[PDB]
Design an enzyme around this catalytic site. Sequence first.
Site, short mmCIF file in Angstrom:
data_model
loop_
_atom_site.label_atom_id
_atom_site.label_comp_id
_atom_site.label_asym_id
_atom_site.label_seq_id
_atom_site.Cartn_x
_atom_site.Cartn_y
_atom_site.Cartn_z
N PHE A 53 0.83 -1.22 0.00
CA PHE A 53 0.00 0.00 0.00
C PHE A 53 0.85 1.24 0.00
O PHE A 53 1.93 1.28 0.59
CB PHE A 53 -0.89 0.11 1.23
N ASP A 146 7.60 1.18 2.60
CA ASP A 146 8.88 1.76 2.96
C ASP A 146 9.91 0.70 3.31
O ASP A 146 10.47 0.71 4.41
CB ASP A 146 8.72 2.71 4.14
N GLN A 166 10.68 -9.43 14.56
CA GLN A 166 11.00 -8.02 14.62
C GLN A 166 12.47 -7.95 14.98
O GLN A 166 12.92 -8.58 15.95
CB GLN A 166 10.14 -7.33 15.67
N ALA A 167 13.18 -7.22 14.14
CA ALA A 167 14.63 -7.02 14.25
C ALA A 167 15.18 -6.60 15.62
O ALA A 167 16.19 -7.14 16.07
CB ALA A 167 15.07 -6.00 13.18
N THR A 178 7.06 -4.85 23.46
CA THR A 178 6.11 -3.77 23.46
C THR A 178 4.75 -4.28 23.03
O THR A 178 4.14 -3.71 22.15
CB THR A 178 6.52 -2.63 22.49
N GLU A 236 0.10 -3.78 14.23
CA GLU A 236 1.17 -4.67 14.65
C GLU A 236 0.93 -5.28 16.03
O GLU A 236 1.45 -6.36 16.35
CB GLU A 236 2.52 -3.96 14.66
O1 LIG Z 1 1.51 8.39 5.10
C1 LIG Z 1 1.57 7.17 5.03
C2 LIG Z 1 2.16 6.28 5.98
C3 LIG Z 1 2.15 4.97 5.80
N1 LIG Z 1 1.60 4.38 4.70
C4 LIG Z 1 1.65 2.98 4.91
O2 LIG Z 1 1.44 2.37 6.12
C5 LIG Z 1 2.34 1.24 6.27
C6 LIG Z 1 3.18 1.46 7.50
O3 LIG Z 1 4.06 2.59 7.27
P1 LIG Z 1 4.87 3.24 8.50
O4 LIG Z 1 4.04 3.54 9.67
O5 LIG Z 1 5.68 4.38 8.03
O6 LIG Z 1 5.81 2.00 9.02
P2 LIG Z 1 6.19 1.78 10.62
O7 LIG Z 1 5.77 2.57 11.83
O8 LIG Z 1 7.65 1.36 10.76
O9 LIG Z 1 5.21 0.56 10.61
C7 LIG Z 1 5.15 -0.46 11.63
O10 LIG Z 1 4.10 -0.08 12.52
C8 LIG Z 1 2.80 0.19 11.92
C9 LIG Z 1 1.89 0.55 13.11
O11 LIG Z 1 2.50 1.68 13.84
C10 LIG Z 1 2.30 -1.00 11.02
O12 LIG Z 1 1.80 -2.03 11.90
C11 LIG Z 1 3.44 -1.57 10.13
O13 LIG Z 1 2.95 -2.80 9.47
C12 LIG Z 1 4.76 -1.83 10.96
O14 LIG Z 1 5.81 -2.26 10.05
C13 LIG Z 1 3.13 1.10 4.98
O15 LIG Z 1 2.53 0.10 4.17
C14 LIG Z 1 3.01 2.53 4.41
O16 LIG Z 1 3.11 2.56 2.98
C15 LIG Z 1 0.99 5.15 3.72
O17 LIG Z 1 0.49 4.68 2.72
N2 LIG Z 1 1.01 6.52 3.94
C1 LIG Z 2 6.63 -2.61 15.76
O1 LIG Z 2 6.80 -1.84 16.96
C2 LIG Z 2 8.04 -1.13 16.99
C3 LIG Z 2 8.31 -0.72 18.42
O2 LIG Z 2 9.17 -1.65 19.06
C4 LIG Z 2 7.97 0.01 16.00
O3 LIG Z 2 6.78 0.77 16.20
C5 LIG Z 2 7.93 -0.62 14.62
O4 LIG Z 2 7.63 0.40 13.68
C6 LIG Z 2 6.86 -1.73 14.50
O5 LIG Z 2 7.26 -2.57 13.44
MN LIG Z 3 7.36 0.63 7.55
#
Ligand SMILES: O=c1ccn([C@@H]2O[C@H](COP(=O)(O)OP(=O)(O)O[C@H]3O[C@H](CO)[C@H](O)[C@H](O)[C@H]3O)[C@@H](O)[C@H]2O)c(=O)[nH]1
Ligand SMILES: *[C@@H]1O[C@H](CO)[C@H](O)[C@H](O)[C@H]1O
Ligand SMILES: [Mn+2]
EC number: 2.4.1.87
Length: 277
Positions: A53, A146, A166-167, A178, A236
Amino acid sequence: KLKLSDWFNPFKRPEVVTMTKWKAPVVWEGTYNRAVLDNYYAKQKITVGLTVFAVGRYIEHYLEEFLTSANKHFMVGHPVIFYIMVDDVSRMPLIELGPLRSFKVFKIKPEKRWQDISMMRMKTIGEHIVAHIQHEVDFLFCMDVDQVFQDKFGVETLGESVAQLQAWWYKADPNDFTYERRKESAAYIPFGEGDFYYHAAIFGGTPTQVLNITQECFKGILKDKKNDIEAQWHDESHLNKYFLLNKPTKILSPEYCWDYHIGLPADIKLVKMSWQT
Ligand SMILES: O=c1ccn([C@@H]2O[C@H](COP(=O)(O)OP(=O)(O)O[C@H]3O[C@H](CO)[C@H](O)[C@H](O)[C@H]3O)[C@@H](O)[C@H]2O)c(=O)[nH]1
Ligand SMILES: *[C@@H]1O[C@H](CO)[C@H](O)[C@H](O)[C@H]1O
Ligand SMILES: [Mn+2]
Ligand SMILES: [Hg+2]
């Protein structure tokens, strides 16, 4: 007619956790035989789907790099269909796909809060599985845009339901996880429970398993909403909840979704996919 000892040798990596209390393998570099599996799966004319997405800025910042790297490294040598969900298709980058890759684009309604963009995925994915993915593929992966493929992300990763370690917490203990701890969340995991902390940037399985994961997670997302509460790590946290009540049949080492900000530990032999800059 395919058995673990056919493609998986844990002893190739004794230092890390390669099996789980529930007999599920954990794939690490060096522990697997792609060649045999490539051969096994190509015979079955297996085909793999990948949904991703991208709404708003994420489209120009990550879609293309995602698709380009996936084209080059995801299930190479097998038919793969990329399912691209965007809010504005006119901004959709069109890269050149190689042998055995084809795609489909879909226009989705852009949610106001990113947290909901990320969570509404659970509902959309499910709708598409019931509508067509169920009939088009044998295995389905749902990834975060991303990200970027670095090396071969092959058939050693298929299974009935696949989770991602999760890494930052695979080496950690469960009460440090968490997880959501507010018993008011459907995502709640007591302080005694929990097997691992799974990354939600990558989950997969068969369409039927993925439809179940995604349905359960959205119900949770909705239950929590009617209750005026929001799991800390959103979808998540629900996934982690889910993967606790329904252990995954395969788990992938952090080598499959690596954060280079964690440096490069000695237990990560080869990085298949890393988080984006
Ligand atoms: O403005 C935005 C932001 C995000 N996305 C999508 O949302 C998903 C998550 O993006 P992002 O929040 O930037 O990744 P992280 O915080 O690192 O995401 C982690 O945490 C999220 C909840 O905070 C979700 O659970 C993700 O699956 C998990 O990898 C991706 O598919 C993005 O493409 C969009 O389309 N538009
Ligand atoms: C899962 O949670 C962590 C926090 O440990 C962080 O929000 C990551 O973006 C997510 O993949
Ligand atoms: Mn991401
Ligand atoms: Hg975001």
